[PDB]
Amino acid sequence: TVSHEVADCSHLKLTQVPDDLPTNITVLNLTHNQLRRLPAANFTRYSQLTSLDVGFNTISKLEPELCQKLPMLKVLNLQHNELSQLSDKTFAFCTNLTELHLMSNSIQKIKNNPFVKQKNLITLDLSHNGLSSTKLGTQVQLENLQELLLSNNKIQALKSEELDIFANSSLKK
């Protein structure tokens, strides 16, 4: 796992997050591994991560406290996992996120408000899920959102109310 300013762990057969890395590491790439979970305790040492690419692993669920240990996290990639369920507290503490990638997670539906808390989010990706609607919330949030990816889902119609949460959003894509 060679790392001078960015840490990469691609195809390293890793099952748990390594605990021997420089403290000032800002980028942690853990793609194509066997990470079952991402406990917050394993990320206590890393308090300066900006981008955490954990996609192409076997994560089934996360914990909100993980975002507590990463106050400066900007890019969070959860591509190709099985996080089929989300909660309103899942992304509450991740208030400085810019990119949130959730492609190919077999998510079936969005319940109440998983993205209300974050306000600086720029792009939200939800492609290759089982979503049958564009409903992502109830109130108006995602003020600064510019890109919304909803490709390869089960959406069959577009309704005005389902998009009402983007009243103050200038969707560039």
Ligand X SMILES: *[C@@H]1O[C@H](CO)[C@@H](O[C@@H]2O[C@H](CO)[C@@H](O)[C@H](O)[C@H]2NC(C)=O)[C@H](O)[C@H]1NC(C)=O
Ligand Y SMILES: *[C@@H]1O[C@H](CO)[C@@H](O)[C@H](O)[C@H]1NC(C)=O
For position 29 contacting ligand X by CB under 6 A, the verdict is yes
Is residue 90 within 8 Å of residue 64, measured between CB atoms? yes
Asked if residues 60 and 40 have their Cβ atoms less than 8 Å apart, the reply is no
In angstroms, rounded to a whole number, what is the distance separating the alpha carbons of residues 27 and 75? 9
| Among 51, 95, 146, 153, contact with ligand X (rule: CB under 6 A) | 51
Instruction: Tell me which residues in 2-31 interact with RNA (CB under 7 A).
Output: 11, 13
Out of 2, 157, 158, 167, the residue judged to bind ligand Y by CB under 6 A: 167
Q: Please, what is the minimum distance in Å from the beta carbon of residue 136 to ligand Y? A: 16
CA distance 82 to 160: 30
Cα 86 from Cα 15, distance rounded (Å): 23
Residue 29 interacting entry, from ligand Y, ligand X, RNA, none, C-beta within 5 to 8 Å by type: ligand X
Residue 138 found at the interface with ligand Y (CB under 6 A): no
- 140 counts as binding ligand Y under rule CB under 6 A: yes
